[PDB]
Amino acid sequence: SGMRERVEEALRRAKERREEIIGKYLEWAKTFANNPELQKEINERALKAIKDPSDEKDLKALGIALAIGMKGPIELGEEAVEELLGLLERLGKLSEKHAELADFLKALVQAYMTLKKTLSEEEYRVTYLGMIAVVLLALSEGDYDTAKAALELVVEGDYEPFLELAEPYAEEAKEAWEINKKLVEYGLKVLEKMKEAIKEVE
Ligand SMILES: [Mg+2]
Ligand SMILES: [Mg+2]
């Protein structure tokens, strides 16, 4: 039970700034879905990151591409998710920086799956928005341990702090799910491209 003070403080500050954080997340996702030049940029920097993780901006692009791509496997169930986690494990064996990214993405997959199998559809989507608000605040400050901690809390079923954060943003949670639907094709393609690139540098 409970959570570390750094995680409590990230939740407190994200709730104070939740109109800003949730609004910026939704608008970035809308811009990405409607701007093909932004999609090409994320994809080419993600491919560079597979060959060389040293630049934080390239590794961020790899994380964004895989966080969008993972929605496919999550909606396909246990076999697809196990294959996706197997791919992340192979990615993590490449270097210590790749391992840090892969460990974060594995926790994000597990958080999604816990929510979907235990909550109603609307509570699932709203809790996810509150969780990602805290995660984005932590990552923007370079605090990767706090970001992963928030995901672990949801894996264990402690959804209530994150649902509570996003309750007044239920409409934005629905719109963020409408936007993911426009990205299904992008995600399937980029996942196949990353899988091929990882095989090449093994
Ligand atoms: Mg290299
Ligand atoms: Mg460099």
Author numbering: -1 to 200
Original authors' sentences:
We show that in both cases, it is possible to generate catalysts that exhibit activities rivalling those optimized by in vitro evolution, along with exquisite stereoselectivity. High-resolution structures of six of the designs revealed near-atomic active site design precision.
The crystal structures agree with the design models, having backbone Cα RMSD values between 0.68 Å and 1.2 Å. One of the three lysine conformations points away from the active site, partially explaining its low catalytic rate. Both results highlight how the prediction of activity needs to account for catalytic contributions beyond the interactions specified in the catalytic array and their conformational dynamics.
